């Protein structure tokens, strides 16, 4: 157990637990400090830390000490005895809180027992030397006014009050002659400057601070956790493992980059959470090795120590026993000490990954910042930590008896205001970057708001070094984790070995290095005319002395005029916001503009499914103009083209080492040592893949995800500026009214702010999801593949290396040089899939990853789309696409492959995508339109198979071919074994749903089957179990290849590939998404057009067509003529028959050239009667359910309706459309739908039934039925002449 002593500042010095100490940095000169032993080996000196600081620097100035901290200054802190005593009692309370739980009690026990080794690097291995400043500190015994009598004591930790900056807590180690005992295995007296009352404030981006933009946001820290964070540094320093290694260094070559001190791995380890992941596995092992090497030096010292010259009273055995336990060394029955690898590993992991701020916070139910790399806010002052009503030893601020335990409400600034006070801004100093234009207006930007982008020098290149493989050689992995529960239950973690007495000889060698600090300018001026994130955010603000502003979509005007505020919301939103109204209409206007605000903000939920993008925030570019000028043009389009990359302010140069070669050592005549070597080399190979992935993750988190974090914060600020601006306008307009008017105005400012705030919260959630998706996308498509390329290269090099090794030892391997030959091929065959959870256990990051992998669209590895008269891959993997001259392309994303040799597309796929999952798993989807057979060429049509898409490599791959009315999918494995599955449509149907009509094809492949889906429905299936490996990343050639007719062609659209098997559900969804359009379509599936001649088809009367009756102004219905020749393979009904209709636009006299017909358009349905254009009319006064339509010349009669509304009542994909007659555009009076009706005719000569072109009210209720009735006689399709259909 840990005992925390009690005392008052004025208690008498007793030279034991209350002393006059001579601090290490005093160099044995100057004055002494009254110090209090709070626990064994730990001292508290309730006075400001002044070592290395100028007295005046304790005042706020035009300078700052740290570039990444909102620095608070207060020279009066601790300037009285009562203030010093309060500091003392507060420290006692914090220590009691720390030991209130086993985890914290153990941290203290480890620290108390982690006594510094007696000596350092300069001390002979045979000796213990206490006469060094890192081991002994002196206390003055003599009476006041004379340093006549001094006594030495051993100490572990000395905690002082703060230095100039109250909120800048720091743990300091002792350097002597340029070396640090605490960094070389020995450990040394540790010092700390700490302030309990002025604590840091933080706010989680992904989480709302009580969700109130008009209230105080964020949470304040529990000083006990802040102290434990420092105590962890103390722990590391005491065990001598606070080693230095390759640090994370910020790139500062660009003006938008955050400047900061180099960050050592030890600091990131101390924080925990995701931060250890920024330290590559290479560096993790580097640090591990250095610490182990340091301990070896200590264990050697224990085996050689014979005496202590500095203090004859030191019992050598007692210390050897204590140090053996401290470092967890093992000792044999003879007393020989050695390192136990298991015990060392456990100790190391416990100290680096067990005791972390994140783990401690979690255990103590204390909320803390999400990461070391999270913006810093202004600190606050805790009113009274000694008041149990506000802060307790057991629960800190989150007191359950006050219902503040839930959701860390006790630390919530918006909720627990009674616990703290805001700090006077006049006492705060912050490093700012003054961005000046070349003229010249300037904008100040806190350095903390800039992008933190780790420089390339931050990462280890150890992966490029060679590795000697031996029967020995084993894997090397360091799990940046340690089960906190076992640590809390570990029975032998805490020492039960006697702590030596602290009294020793007085220190006489005061040699020590004392740091010297100095402020630097708080403002750095730079010149740039760039208008990026900082400038855009700035344009959305207004000075405090202005109260009348107006919104503008002009960024430039917003910068020029103080009364103009930039807004990235719609033109209509902006206009309405600037509208001035009468008091009587003010309440209405407020409701309107506030509602508009929510609508605008909610556009952050916009979907873009047709472009294979589930979510996109269209206004991010306009809001920040971050990255590659995202404020220009249409952001959504730009995103569809370049993806996440366009949002990055800077594209990082990644470190992706050429993996060093392996050196396989041979063992002649040794069958085992040779086999072992081969195996070890294989396992080491995987370590290489893992370490590379870890190197990628570290860079992604410190150079990319950091930039996206800044963008998320930027959008939060942007949205708030918009709400603040609207709030300002509303206030101004309301205050223009008189008191009498105001009294009659029904407005609730809190309800307004509530609605605005809620809108922002909804938007932020979408924005965070969007940005996290972008971050993972960059990782997977722009980083991982580049690493895979090197790893695959490495594999190849290692492959022949191993085979050539199995060759050189062929003899010594006898009848096995083949068994292990394949053992190498099959091992280097299956590559390691990237799993983020392997490099981090951070829930946020893991969830981001899993979410990404759960989105089927992220499985797209090829997406050929039209953009600027060319076809490019928008999958994000950058396939090279060569479209040759003979390929016809249009903006409807359709492309035509003809019989010409130059009508082809060459696609070179990305070779670094996990495609060969080792069992075949991928899908291909596309739309196609295959022309009808030539009647005089039917034999060749059914006989000649021709390839249309071929993807082969090493005589293995896949291809899509066509043989007449059959489309074929074929797979060929490395052995040449072939399997096919096909879809063949009937060519004897009166009316075919497939011939010359666009239809959707989807082919899926898995370990068992090959399936072909047509328009979302499964059509064919082939068992492909026997098929072995199939290379599918070869070049893809789109070209008609075979014995084809010169007239042969094929149209294709939306070609894409998925590296997974699509489900029937995925396919059906894709079919509907790609079928969707605002416009109606024609019989063939193309957009329906105005001013284009069409024959009419009736889905409910397939073989019927319309003809103007010779003797009457009506359309009689006749039977389609049919294929006349004698071929046994074909049959169809003629399509180019009946009246030639033409659709004309109703309004806008923009002439009659042509255009696209959209659902709900009002039209005129006309047709040609010889040299005249006639029209389809409905007699206005029929009383029956239906009537024959009236066909006559164009004219305007008061007795006939002439306006039709084209409709689409079917919710599912169809090329059918309906035609409605309404009394007039305005009314909701429906006359009926155009269809076909059967009439009975009994004349003097003939008696029979005849069908006529009619309008009927009966259809009105029928089109509402579900599922939509495709057989209804009111379903029509328009057939224009098409080269793909001849008769």
Query: Active-site residue numbers?
Result: 230
Compute the least distance from the CB of residue 271 to Zn ion, in Å: 7
Binding site for D-galactose: what residues are annotated?
1236-1237
Torsion, Cα 705 711 713 717, to 10 degrees, reads 180
Number of residues that bind Ca ion (CB under 5 A): 6
For Zn ion, the closer CB: 107 or 559? 107
Distance CA 130, CA 504 (A): 8
* Beta strands in 133-285, from DSSP E residues, in sequence order: 136-140, 150-154, 157-160, 170-173, 175-176, 179-180, 190-193, 198-199, 201-202, 219-220
For Ca ion, the closer CB: 21 or 533? 533
* Contact yes or no for 198/72 (Cβ under 8 A): yes
User: What are the CA-CA distances from residue 134 to residues 26, 137, 374, 1193 (Å)?
Assistant: 13, 8, 34, 109
For Zn ion, the closer CB: 261 or 818? 261
423-482 residues near Ca ion, rule: CB under 5 A? 480
Distance CA 861, CA 863 (A): 7
Number of residues that bind Zn ion (CB under 5 A): 1
Segment near Ca ion (CB under 5 A); pick from 138-146, 223-231, 559-567, 1102-1110: 559-567
Compute the least distance from the CB of residue 264 to Zn ion, in Å: 9
480-509 residues near Ca ion, rule: CB under 5 A? 480
For Zn ion, the closer CB: 265 or 390? 265
Interface with Ca ion, residue 1251, by CB under 5 A = no
Among 116, 163, 237, 276, binds Ca ion (CB under 5 A): 276
Binding site for Zn(2+): what residues are annotated?
229, 233, 267
278-317 residues near Zn ion, rule: CB under 5 A? none
Compute the least distance from the CB of residue 194 to Zn ion, in Å: 12
Q: Report DSSP state, residue 15.
A: S
User: What are the CA-CA distances from residue 325 to residues 239, 243, 330 (Å)?
Assistant: 12, 21, 8
For Ca ion, the closer CB: 840 or 1269? 840
Helix (H, G, I), strand (E, B) or coil at 802: helix
Compute the least distance from the CB of residue 201 to Zn ion, in Å: 17
Element (H, E) at 780: none
Identify what 876 binds: Ca ion, Zn ion, none; CB under 5 to 8 Å per kind.
none
Identify what 276 binds: Zn ion, Ca ion, none; CB under 5 to 8 Å per kind.
Ca ion
* Contact yes or no for 315/307 (Cβ under 8 A): no
Binding site for a ganglioside GT1b (d18:1(4E)): what residues are annotated?
1021, 1185-1186
Identify what 236 binds: Ca ion, Zn ion, none; CB under 5 to 8 Å per kind.
none
Compute the least distance from the CB of residue 171 to Zn ion, in Å: 7
* Beta strands in 452-522, from DSSP E residues, in sequence order: 467-469, 503-504, 520-521
Tokens of 923: 């899908």
Q: x-or-dash pattern for Ca ion, window 908-927, by CB under 5 A?
A: --------------------
* Contact yes or no for 360/148 (Cβ under 8 A): no
Identify what 284 binds: Ca ion, Zn ion, none; CB under 5 to 8 Å per kind.
Ca ion
Torsion, Cα 638 639 641 646, to 10 degrees, reads 80
Among 41, 564, 1011, 1175, binds Ca ion (CB under 5 A): 564
The answer to whether the bond into 605 is cis (omega within 30° of 0) is: no
Identify what 1005 binds: Ca ion, Zn ion, none; CB under 5 to 8 Å per kind.
none
Binding site: what residues are annotated?
229, 233, 267, 1021, 1185-1186, 1236-1237
Compute the least distance from the CB of residue 276 to Ca ion, in Å: 5
For Ca ion, the closer CB: 74 or 284? 284
Q: 1225-1239 burial, b if ≥16 CB within 10 A, otherwise e?
A: eeeeeebbbbbbbee
Distance CA 458, CA 268 (A): 13
242-271 residues near Zn ion, rule: CB under 5 A? 267
Among 279, 298, 907, 1031, binds Ca ion (CB under 5 A): 279
* Contact yes or no for 926/1053 (Cβ under 8 A): yes
Among 68, 74, 267, 284, binds Ca ion (CB under 5 A): 284
Residue 1097, CB-side half-sphere exposure with 13 Å CA sphere: 25
Question: Of 912, 874, 375, whose CA–CA distance to 646 is shortest?
Answer: 874
Question: Of 1247, 1246, 1176, whose CA–CA distance to 1206 is shortest?
Answer: 1176
Among 268, 454, 558, 593, binds Ca ion (CB under 5 A): 558
Segment near Ca ion (CB under 5 A); pick from 407-415, 563-571, 668-676, 1069-1077: 563-571
Question: Of 330, 332, 341, 337, whose CA–CA distance to 292 is shortest?
Answer: 341
Distance CA 876, CA 552 (A): 35
Compute the least distance from the CB of residue 217 to Zn ion, in Å: 25
Segment near Ca ion (CB under 5 A); pick from 102-110, 268-276, 757-765, 1246-1254: 268-276
Q: x-or-dash pattern for Zn ion, window 1109-1128, by CB under 5 A?
A: --------------------
Identify what 283 binds: Zn ion, Ca ion, none; CB under 5 to 8 Å per kind.
none
Compute the least distance from the CB of residue 463 to Ca ion, in Å: 14
User: What are the CA-CA distances from residue 1015 to residues 961, 1022, 1068, 1073 (Å)?
Assistant: 19, 19, 7, 12
For Ca ion, the closer CB: 564 or 865? 564
Tokens of 700: 């992604």
Compute the least distance from the CB of residue 233 to Zn ion, in Å: 6
Q: Report DSSP state, residue 873.
A: E
For Ca ion, the closer CB: 273 or 1138? 273
For Zn ion, the closer CB: 226 or 824? 226
Instruction: Point out the residue whose Cβ comes nearest to Zn ion.
Output: 267
Identify what 480 binds: Ca ion, Zn ion, none; CB under 5 to 8 Å per kind.
Ca ion
Residue 1111, CB-side half-sphere exposure with 13 Å CA sphere: 0
Task: State the residues that interact with Zn ion by CB under 5 A.
Answer: 267
Task: State the residues that interact with Ca ion by CB under 5 A.
Answer: 276, 279, 284, 480, 558, 564
């Amino acid at each position: 157990p840990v005992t925390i002593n009690n005392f008052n500042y004025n208690d008498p010095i007793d030279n034991n637990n209350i002393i006059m100490m001579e601090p290490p940095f005093a160099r044995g000169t100057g004055r002494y400090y009254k110090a209090f032993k709070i626990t064994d080996r730990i001292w508290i000196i309730p006075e400001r830390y002044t070592f290395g600081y100028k007295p005046e620097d304790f005042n706020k100035s035009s300078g700052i000490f740290n570039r990444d901290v909102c620095e608070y200054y207060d020279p009066d802190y601790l300037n009285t005895n009562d203030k010093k005593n309060i500091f003392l009692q507060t420290m006692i309370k914090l220590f009691n809180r720390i030991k209130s739980k086993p985890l914290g009690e153990k941290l203290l026990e480890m620290i108390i027992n982690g006594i510094p080794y007696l000596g350092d690097r300069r001390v002979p291995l045979e000796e213990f030397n206490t006469n060094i400043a890192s081991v002994t500190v002196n206390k003055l015994i003599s009476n006041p006014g004379e340093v006549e009598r001094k006594k030495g004591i051993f100490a572990n930790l000395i905690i002082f009050g703060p230095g100039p900056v109250l909120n800048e807590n720091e743990t300091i180690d002792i350097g002597i002659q340029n070396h640090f005992a605490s960094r070389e295995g020995f450990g040394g007296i540790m010092q700390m400057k700490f302030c309990p009352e002025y604590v840091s404030v933080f706010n989680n981006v992904q989480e709302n601070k009580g969700a109130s933009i008009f209230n105080r946001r964020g949470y304040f820290s529990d000083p006990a956790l802040i102290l434990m964070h420092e105590l962890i540094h103390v722990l590391h320093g005491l065990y001598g493992i606070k080693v230095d290694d390759l640090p994370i260094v910020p790139n500062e070559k660009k003006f938008f980059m955050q400047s900061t001190d180099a960050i050592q791995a030890e600091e990131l380890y101390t924080f925990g959470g995701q931060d250890p992941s920024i330290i590559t596995p290479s560096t993790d092992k580097s640090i591990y090795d250095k610490v182990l090497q340091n301990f070896r030096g200590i264990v050697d010292r224990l085996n050689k120590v014979l005496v202590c010259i500095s203090d004859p009273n030191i019992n050598i055995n007692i210390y050897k026993n204590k140090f053996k336990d401290k470092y967890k060394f093992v000792e044999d029955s003879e007393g020989k000490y050695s390192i136990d690898v298991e015990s060392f590993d456990k100790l190391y992991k416990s100290l680096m990954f067990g005791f972390t701020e994140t783990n401690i916070a979690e255990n103590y139910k204390i909320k803390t910042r999400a990461s070391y790399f999270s913006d810093s806010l202004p600190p606050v002052k805790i009113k009274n930590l000694l008041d149990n009503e506000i802060y307790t030893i057991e629960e800190g601020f989150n007191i359950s008896d006050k219902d503040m335990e839930k959701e860390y409400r006790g630390q919530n600034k918006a909720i627990n205001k009674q616990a703290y006070e805001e700090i006077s801004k006049e006492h705060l100093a912050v490093y700012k970057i003054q961005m000046c234009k070349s003229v010249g207006i300037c904008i100040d930007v806190d350095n903390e708001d800039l992008f933190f982008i780790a420089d390339k020098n931050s990462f280890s290149d150890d992966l490029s070094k060679n590795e000697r493989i031996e029967y020995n050689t084993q894997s090397n992995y360091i799990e940046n984790d340690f089960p906190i529960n076992e640590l809390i239950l570990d029975t032998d973690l805490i020492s039960k070995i006697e702590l030596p007495s602290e009294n020793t000889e007085s220190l006489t060698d005061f040699n020590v290095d004392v740091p010297v600090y100095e402020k630097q300018p708080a403002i750095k001026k730079i010149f740039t005319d760039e208008n990026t994130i900082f400038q855009y955010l700035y344009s959305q603000t207004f000075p405090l002395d202005i109260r009348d502003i107006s919104l503008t979509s002009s960024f430039d005007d917003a910068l020029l005029f103080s009364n103009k505020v930039y807004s990235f919301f719609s033109m209509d939103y902006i206009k309405t916001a600037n509208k001035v109204v009468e008091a009587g209409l003010f309440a209405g206007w407020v409701k309107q503009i506030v509602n508009d605000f929510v609508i605008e903000a909610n556009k952050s939920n916009t979907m873009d499914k047709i472009a294979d993008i589930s979510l996109i925030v269209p206004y991010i570019g306009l809001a920040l103009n971050v990255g590659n000028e995202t404020a220009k043009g249409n952001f959504e389009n730009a995103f569809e083209i370049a993806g996440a990359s366009i949002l990055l302010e800077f594209i990082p140069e990644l470190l992706i080492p050429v993996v060093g070669a392996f050196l396989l050592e041979s063992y002649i005549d040794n069958k085992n040592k040779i086999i072992k070597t081969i195996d070890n080399a294989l396992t080491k190979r995987n370590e290489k893949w893992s370490d590379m992935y870890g190197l990628i993750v570290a860079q992604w988190l410190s150079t990319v995800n950091t930039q996206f974090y800044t963008i998320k914060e930027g959008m939060y600020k942007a949205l708030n500026y918009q709400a603040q601006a609207l709030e300002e306008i509303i206030k101004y307009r309301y205050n223009i009214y008189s008191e009498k008017e105001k009294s009659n105005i029904n407005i609730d400012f809190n309800d307004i702010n509530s609605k605005l705030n809620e809108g922002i919260n909804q938007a932020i959630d979408n924005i965070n999801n969007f940005i996290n998706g972008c971050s993972v996308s960059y990782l997977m498509k722009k980083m991982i593949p580049l690493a895979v390329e090197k790893l695959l290269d490495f594999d190849n090099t290692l492959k022949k290396n191993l085979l050539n090794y199995i060759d050189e030892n062929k003899l010594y391997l006898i009848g096995s040089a083949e068994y292990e030959k394949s053992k190498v091929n099959k091992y280097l065959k299956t590559i390691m899939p990237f799993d983020l959870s392997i490099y981090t256990n951070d829930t946020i990051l893991i969830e981001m990853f899993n979410k990404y992998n759960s989105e089927i669209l992220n499985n797209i590895i090829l997406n050929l789309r039209y953009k600027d008269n060319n076809l490019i891959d928008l999958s994000g993997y950058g396939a090279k696409v060569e479209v040759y001259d003979g390929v016809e392309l249009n903006d409807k994303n359709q492309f035509k492959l003809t019989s010409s040799a130059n009508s082809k597309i060459r696609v070179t796929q990305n070779q670094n995508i996990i495609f060969n999952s080792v069992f075949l798993d991928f899908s291909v989807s596309f739309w196609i339109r295959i022309p009808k057979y030539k009647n005089d060429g039917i034999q060749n049509y059914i006989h000649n198979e021709y390839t249309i898409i071929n993807c082969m490599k090493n005589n293995s791959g896949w291809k899509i071919s066509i043989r007449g009315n059959r489309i074929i999918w074929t797979l060929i494995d490395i052995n040449g074994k072939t399997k096919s599955v096909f879809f063949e449509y009937n060519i004897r149907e009166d009316i075919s749903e497939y011939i010359n009509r666009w239809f959707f094809v989807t082919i899926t492949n898995n370990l068992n089957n090959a399936k072909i889906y047509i328009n979302g429905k499964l059509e064919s299936n082939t068992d492909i179990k026997d098929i072995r490996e199939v290379i599918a990343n070869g070049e893809i050639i789109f070209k008609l290849d075979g014995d084809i007719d010169r007239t042969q062609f094929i149209w294709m659209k939306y070609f894409s590939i998925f590296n997974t098997e699509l489900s029937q559900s995925n396919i059906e969804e894709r079919y509907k998404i790609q079928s969707y359009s605002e416009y109606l379509k024609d019989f063939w599936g193309n957009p329906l057009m105005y001013n284009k001649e069409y024959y009419m088809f009736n889905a409910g009367n397939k073989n019927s067509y319309i003809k103007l009756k010779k003797d009457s102004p009506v359309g009689e219905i006749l039977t389609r003529s049919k294929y006349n020749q004698n071929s046994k393979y074909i049959n169809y009904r003629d399509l180019y028959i009946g009246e030639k209709f033409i659709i004309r636009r109703k309004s806008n006299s923009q002439s009659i050239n042509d255009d696209i017909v959209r659902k709900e358009d009002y039209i005129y349905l006309d047709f040609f009667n010889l040299n005249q254009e006639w029209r389809v009319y409905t007699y206005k006064y029929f009383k029956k359910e239906e009537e024959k339509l009236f066909l006559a010349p164009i004219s305007d009669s008061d007795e006939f309706y002439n306006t039709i509304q084209i409709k689409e009542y079917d919710e599912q994909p169809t090329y059918s459309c309906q035609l409605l007659f309404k009394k007039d555009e305005e009314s909701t009076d429906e006359i009926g739908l155009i269809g076909i009706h059967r009439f009975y005719e009994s004349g003097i000569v003939f008696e029979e039934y005849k069908d006529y072109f009619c309008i009927s009210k009966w259809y009105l209720k029928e089109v509402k039925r579900k599922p939509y009735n495709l057989k209804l006689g009111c379903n029509w399709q328009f057939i224009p002449k098409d080269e793909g259909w001849t008769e």
